[PDB]
Amino acid sequence: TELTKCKVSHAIKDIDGYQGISLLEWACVLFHTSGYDTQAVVNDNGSTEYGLFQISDRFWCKSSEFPESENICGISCDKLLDDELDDDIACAKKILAIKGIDYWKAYKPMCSEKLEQWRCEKP
Amino acid sequence: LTACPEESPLLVGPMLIEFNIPVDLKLVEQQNPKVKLGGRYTPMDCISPHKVAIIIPFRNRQEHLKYWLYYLHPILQRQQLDYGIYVINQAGESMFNRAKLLNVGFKEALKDYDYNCFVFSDVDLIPMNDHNTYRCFSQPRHISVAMDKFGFSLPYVQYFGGVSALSKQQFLSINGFPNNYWGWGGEDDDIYNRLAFRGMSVSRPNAVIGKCRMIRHSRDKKNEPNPQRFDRIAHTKETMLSDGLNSLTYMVLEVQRYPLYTKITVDIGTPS
Numbered sequence: 001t002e003l004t005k006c007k008v009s010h011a012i013k014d015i016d017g018y019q020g021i022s023l024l025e026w027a028c029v030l031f032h033t034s035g036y037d038t039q040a041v042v043n044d045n046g047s048t049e050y051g052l053f054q055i056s057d058r059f060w061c062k063s064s065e066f067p068e069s070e071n072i073c074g075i076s077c078d079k080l081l082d083d084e085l086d087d088d089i090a091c092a093k094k095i096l097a098i099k100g101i102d103y104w105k106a107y108k109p110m111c112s113e114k115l116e117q118w119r120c121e122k123p
Numbered sequence: 124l125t126a127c128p129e130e131s132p133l134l135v136g137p138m139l140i141e142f143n144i145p146v147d148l149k150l151v152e153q154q155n156p157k158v159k160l161g162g163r164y165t166p167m168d169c170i171s172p173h174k175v176a177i178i179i180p181f182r183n184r185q186e187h188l189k190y191w192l193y194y195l196h197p198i199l200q201r202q203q204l205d206y207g208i209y210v211i212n213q214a215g216e217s218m219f220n221r222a223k224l225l226n227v228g229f230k231e232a233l234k235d236y237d238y239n240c241f242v243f244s245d246v247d248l249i250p251m252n253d254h255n256t257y258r259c260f261s262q263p264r265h266i267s268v269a270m271d272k273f274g275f276s277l278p279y280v281q282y283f284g285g286v287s288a289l290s291k292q293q294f295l296s297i298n299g300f301p302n303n304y305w306g307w308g309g310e311d312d313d314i315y316n317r318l319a320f321r322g323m324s325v326s327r328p329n330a331v332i333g334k335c336r337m338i339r340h341s342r343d344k345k346n347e348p349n350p351q352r353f354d355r356i357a358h359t360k361e362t363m364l365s366d367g368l369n370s371l372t373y374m375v376l377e378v379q380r381y382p383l384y385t386k387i388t389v390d391i392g393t394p395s
């Protein structure tokens with residue numbers, strides 16, 4: 001489900017400020033990360049990243065592919081391919097607390113400036 | 124003998140762009156008799172100062188190309204451009220390399236005519252207003268500004284993907300485009316960075332005259348997101364001296380001249 005800047009901004013509300021990242025930076029990161037597609041599935045050197053946040057099955061979620069994963073978020077990777085973002089967000093929160101914002105590689109190069117444009121301009 | 128006017132009197136403004144009625148290139152050829160073998164058109168009424176080579180990155184996108192040809196040949200003519208159409212076809216079945224095919228387009232078009240302007244256009248983007256001229260400006264030109272795909276909005280101010288235009292000198296100044304971006308994403312942000320590191324900024328038509336349509340499609344097999352794009356994008360400043368025009372290598376497998384375009388199949392190697 002291809003969402004939009006604003007839907008995303010509205011859905012993502014509860015992650016705001018956590019670990020110091022604003023909704024502006026998140027909209028920016030998610031656009032470059034998943035194109036705002038909740039069903040985004042991208043391969044990366046033998047592992048797979050899921051949904052809006054592109055959470056990897058290598059350490060964060062359990063996938064039928066490789067069950068040995070530490071499944072840190074304690075969720076099935078498939079649950080990050082639906083339109084309920086609460087668990088995606090909950091897991092993103094763990095990543096932030098453990099590894100930090102740099103898990104999202106789009107952050108530093110694409111979201112270190114010109115953040116104003118990322119605000120949802122609709123109530 | 125008379126220089127064409129800074130603005131064309133043939134322009135029509137906004138146009139209707141739909142992708143249902145199947146096109147017939149033969150029918151398209153008929154509607155465009157001034158277009159010569161190889162996809163070359165030059166104004167007879169006046170002398171245009173815009174010698175433009177339109178470069179299309181390509182592989183298995185023939186349906187898109189028919190639509191592209193059907194809408195753009197009439198537009199580019201109205202824009203009184205002295206243009207040539209080049210479809211750079213990637214031979215083989217390994218990872219797609221958009222930017223690298225564009226560099227090839229640049230060197231190969233130069234063999235035909237002394238073009239002074241280069242328009243790099245994706246095969247599936249059609250402008251919705253002929254006021255969006257396909258030519259070069261005082262600064263590099265980003266042309267596909269307000270795509271329906273993005274709500275007729277620019278996804279992000281640093282975006283240089285889709286349809287861009289650089290003069291020969293502007294292109295030469297950044298050592299062309301990178302050859303090391305395989306798979307989808309980041310090659311355009313890298314190009315964007317290249318412009319900044321050379322003191323150039325981006326010029327754009329406004330969001331109204333810049334409306335464009337992209338034929339809807341899924342990501343092509345062999346052009347999956349490039350996992351390294353984000354890290355490559357951060358070293359543009361240094362890698363642009365070693366990766367680009369000066370390091371381009373490819374082999375021409377075949378040159379095809381059709382009435383509506385020139386298509387060049389090349390072998391650009393593999394991700395290494």
Ligand SMILES: O=c1ccn([C@@H]2O[C@H](COP(=O)(O)OP(=O)(O)O)[C@@H](O)[C@H]2O)c(=O)[nH]1
Pocket residue numbers: 179180181182183184219221244245246247248284285307342343344346
């Ligand atoms: O298998 C492929 C992949 C890409 N392209 C060309 O590369 C451009 C950009 O790729 P894509 O359409 O995926 O770009 P995006 O839609 O994501 O801007 C296309 O428009 C085509 O001109 C192609 O010809 N064959």
Ligand SMILES: O=c1ccn([C@@H]2O[C@H](COP(=O)(O)OP(=O)(O)O)[C@@H](O)[C@H]2O)c(=O)[nH]1
Pocket residue numbers: 148149152185379381382383384
């Ligand atoms: O200006 C043109 C270009 C192409 N064609 C037709 O479009 C087809 C395109 O075939 P394709 O590119 O798939 O063949 P390839 O070039 O790869 O042999 C040709 O065979 C022609 O019948 C045409 O009628 N006018």
Ligand SMILES: [Ca+2]
Pocket residue numbers: 079080081082083084085086087088
């Ligand atoms: Ca979910």
Ligand SMILES: [Mn+2]
Pocket residue numbers: 245247337340
């Ligand atoms: Mn496309």
